[PDB]
Structures are given as C-alpha cells and as structure tokens.
Amino acid sequence: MSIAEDITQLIGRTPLVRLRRVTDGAVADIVAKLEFFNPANSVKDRIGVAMLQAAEQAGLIKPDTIILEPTSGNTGIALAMVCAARGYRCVLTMPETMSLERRMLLRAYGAELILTPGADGMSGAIAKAEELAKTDQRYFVPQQFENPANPAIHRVTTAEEVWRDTDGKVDIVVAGVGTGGTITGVAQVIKERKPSARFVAVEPAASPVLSGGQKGPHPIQGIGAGFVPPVLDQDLVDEIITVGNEDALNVARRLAREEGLLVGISSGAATVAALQVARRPENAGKLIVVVLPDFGERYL
Amino acid sequence: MSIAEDITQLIGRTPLVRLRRVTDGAVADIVAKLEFFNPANSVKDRIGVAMLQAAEQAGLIKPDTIILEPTSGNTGIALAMVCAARGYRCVLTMPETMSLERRMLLRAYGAELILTPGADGMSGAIAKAEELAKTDQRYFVPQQFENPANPAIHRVTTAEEVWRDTDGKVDIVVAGVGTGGTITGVAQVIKERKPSARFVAVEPAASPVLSGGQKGPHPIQGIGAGFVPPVLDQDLVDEIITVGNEDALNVARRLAREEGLLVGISSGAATVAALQVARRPENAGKLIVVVLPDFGERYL
Numbered sequence A, B: 001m002s003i004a005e006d007i008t009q010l011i012g013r014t015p016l017v018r019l020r021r022v023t024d025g026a027v028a029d030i031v032a033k034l035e036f037f038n039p040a041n042s043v044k045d046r047i048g049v050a051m052l053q054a055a056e057q058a059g060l061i062k063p064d065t066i067i068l069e070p071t072s073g074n075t076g077i078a079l080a081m082v083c084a085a086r087g088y089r090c091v092l093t094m095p096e097t098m099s100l101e102r103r104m105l106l107r108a109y110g111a112e113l114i115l116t117p118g119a120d121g122m123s124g125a126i127a128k129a130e131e132l133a134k135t136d137q138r139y140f141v142p143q144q145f146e147n148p149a150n151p152a153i154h155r156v157t158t159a160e161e162v163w164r165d166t167d168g169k170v171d172i173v174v175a176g177v178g179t180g181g182t183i184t185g186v187a188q189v190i191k192e193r194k195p196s197a198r199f200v201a202v203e204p205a206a207s208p209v210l211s212g213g214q215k216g217p218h219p220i221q222g223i224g225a226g227f228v229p230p231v232l233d234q235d236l237v238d239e240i241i242t243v244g245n246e247d248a249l250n251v252a253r254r255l256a257r258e259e260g261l262l263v264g265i266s267s268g269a270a271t272v273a274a275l276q277v278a279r280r281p282e283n284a285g286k287l288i289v290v291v292l293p294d295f296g297e298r299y300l
C-alpha cells in the first residue's frame, strides 16, 4: 500500500513542467520545478520538516519544548503546518502590519502569534524572538538562515529530484536566493556529480546585495534578504542576475495567463532570469531548470 | 526524463494519508485522499481537463470557440486554469455577490467574468449562460452536472489511484456529493472489481435531498446542490449520511490543527461521516477511504 503516515511524509517530490509560451527568444529548453505542489503551497515545507527532523534526531526537542521563529513569509506557514502534524506548540513573531489573511492562515494551523511594533518591522520581530528565547528555555528556535538542515534537505530531496527527473541532463539551475538553501543544496550535489553544470542566483535589482550593491526595499517576497545569507555557498554560484520589480510581476502574470501556472512574484523573478540565460547562443540545446518557489493565490 | 509538457498533465495522482488523531472511537482504519494536491488545489481540476479533453477528442472545439460555464465554486477555478494552459478564451457567469478574492483568482488565470444580479443568485448565472449560448454559437458549455466526462475521469484516474494505492484493500469509500461524479466514477470501477466494497454518499443535514428531504440553504460549499444530480448513480450508493453545519466546521478545524490538513468545509463533512462509519463494530479492521475535495485556505 502507498499511504503516508502523516502529511509531512508528502513534502517535496515536486514535478517539472516544460514552459511553452513564456519562452520568447529562448534557444535552450526551460523547465520549471513547481514547489507550489508542496502541501502548504511553497518550498518552505521542505525546511519546516527538515529543521524539526534534525532537532528530533539530535535530541533537542523536550517534552515542554515550544517551537519559536520570527517570520513574515512562507517558513511560518511551513512551521505551523508541520507543528500541527507533529502535535507541537508553535509560536511565531511578526510585525503587527502582517495581513489579517496571513494571521488567519497561521492560526488555522493552531500557531500562536506574537505581534511586534509595526514601526520596528522584521528587526522588531527578531528582537522579540531573541528575548523570548533568552528568558524561557522551553523555546527551540529553528533559525532558518543558519540551520544546516536547510541546505541539507535540498541536497537529499530537491537536488536528487532535479537529477532524476532530468535523467542527469540538467545543464543550468536558476534560483532566487532568500536563505540560499535551495540553490546551495542543489549545487552541492549536482555540481560535484556533473562539474559542467552551472548555477544562477537571482536577486532583486532593488536590493542587489549579492551583486555588491546596497540593501533596499522591494516587493519580491521570498528573496532579497538585504544581507549575504550565511547558508549560501557563494563559491558554488556561477552568476547573479538582478531582476526589476516590474519585470518580475509581468512574467509572473504571463506564467498564470499563458501557462496556467499561478505562482508568486519570486517565481516571476526566477523566470525572468531563466529566459535571459536561455537566449544566449552558447546555451543552445541546453536544459535549464528554474525553481518556482510558491503559489500565487496568496499575492492577489 | 520525467517532465510534464504542460500543467494539465500534472492533474490528479493525489496521495493518501492516514488519519491519526481525528479518529475518536474508530475501529476501522481511516485514510484521506488529498485532492488539494491538484495544481489549483481542488478535485475539480480533474473534470476541468477531462471535459475539455472530451470536447477536443470529439471535434467540438473550433477555432473561434469560447468556453462558457456558470459557476460559483471550484469548477470555475479548474476551467480558468486549464483554459490558460490550453490558450482558450474562458467566460464564467456568477452572481455579483461573489467575493473580490474569487474574482481576482479567476481573472489571474485570464478568465472573463459576467456578473449577474445578486438577488437572482445562481439561477440568474445559469440563465445568463443559457441565453449567451443560445444566441452565440461560439460558446461551448461544459455542463459539469451532465457531462459524462465527469464520472469518466474519476473511473480512469481517481478510482484506479484508490485501488492501486490501497493494493485493492479499500473496503468503504466515503465521499460528499456535489455533481456526484467522484463517488459515481469510483464506485463504477471499484464495486465491479470488488463487489464487497461499499460507498457512502455525504450531504448536508440542512439540505438532505438525497435522503428524501427538501432543499435548503447551507454553507457546506461543494456539496448539497439542492437536487438529485443527473451524473449520480444512486444504485451504486449504499448509504447516505447527512452532516450538520457545525459538525462539518468543527471537524474541518480539527483536521487542520490536529493533522496539519487544511481542508475545506466539505472535507470536514466527509470526515464526520467517515468517523461515524468507522465506529461501527462490523467495520472493525476495515479500510475506509475518505475523499477530501479541496484546500481550506480559500474559506478563511
């Protein structure tokens, strides 16, 4: 029988789909890895389960442990879902500016929210989690930007899925960088197995930090953290492509209307970059895999 | 290589998961079929592609064809997505009372909406589609309640998935009835293959039409159409269970908080029924498969 014991056993193993229309000028094949197929509709389901699994396996979860993370994006959703499946108490800090829709989603999974001053933004949320954890030893903080289980799950799952599903023919992987876990884990496995493979990191033109520029505000949720992420192995990244806000939005729109792929704005951004790489004559005939991190319905 | 040519090739093949906590009093095994794993998060993706496939295969789609359907639920989403992938123009009628969120979702896939008088509700939407189709021969109307491709896709996909994933050990299938396609197609295949198998239809206590009662208003979106659906084969249905609004909601809540399964209210209703059947001593040791039609995030 093929029956999962719980929802966390159904995370990952996401499909590839060939882009047919959003391919203007391409001389390479572009195929998209659809992370919206995860149970809570994003890539972060992988790291939500992986980080808790690593803690469990290291004996860090105690009978009175409470999971705690500062989060304004998909990792909060992923942790809330996984904690519901696990039977863990889950506390998430975030600015009081977070939408009522997002709060209802997290609360639907039974997570408890601590809202921090709007003016202090995400620094205030992080500060609150830091203080909570320092003063109450029940809290276990996954730390998505520093946890080695983040790139590790991408080595074990995402990378192998890309490898197997392309029968090792993948030539170039294009991925937005938030924590850097996805592109790092995939590159760690695939570049060592196929040294000719290349890896393109995608960031916002509005906050081109990996490119050597300065942090700034931008709407491409999921990428452009404003610092070099500790988990990112920059030596595995062969190129950085910056993407403008309007281009990201426009291509995200095109994916929905022309491919039936309703994806987030960071998926638009990743696809802008993949299409740029795909137009290069030296890439004629190559296979480009672009990661599409989440579903677009939350962004409407 | 395992690469889909387009998103419609990634419809169905949804997983089974064992219920662990929402099992109070059960002496049978309850496993849930997670239709939220479809690309647009509901079971209707199956019939959206199947109905257009059947039209294509029957030469009914012409160069100037426009897809037209009256819809206030998931079939509109499914058709909008599939039409985007196909490159078809898609027009959907619905009452002007439909939420801005739902309209934005359908428009994100490029569908065009015709809003009908709020006071006339869904009868007004159906009337508008009827009139449009009568006066403009470009329109092709799928007719989800009457189209034989609805139960047929469930015979070819859903039923075989249940059969294979349970290694033929499925004893009882529990499913909400909207169009009746899901329970009909599954029963057609499985009852003939395994005559001992039984099939339980689920409807709202507030609108217990299959049970012999009268139509009434109810909030269990997706089931309780207020009439006997033409596609439903009542002779394959072994039992009908009515479910109250509060019980459906309560169990839907429990699935999210206790299993990490964020599902719609009709999934709550189906699970209420499955748990009732599972408590019967004569069902000790049996395998019950309950269909969970969609994701809960839209209902928040």
Ligand SMILES: [Cl-]
Pocket: A070, A071, A072, A073, A074, A075, A076
């Ligand atoms: Cl986050």
Ligand SMILES: [Cl-]
Pocket: B070, B071, B072, B073, B074, B075, B076
């Ligand atoms: Cl509908």
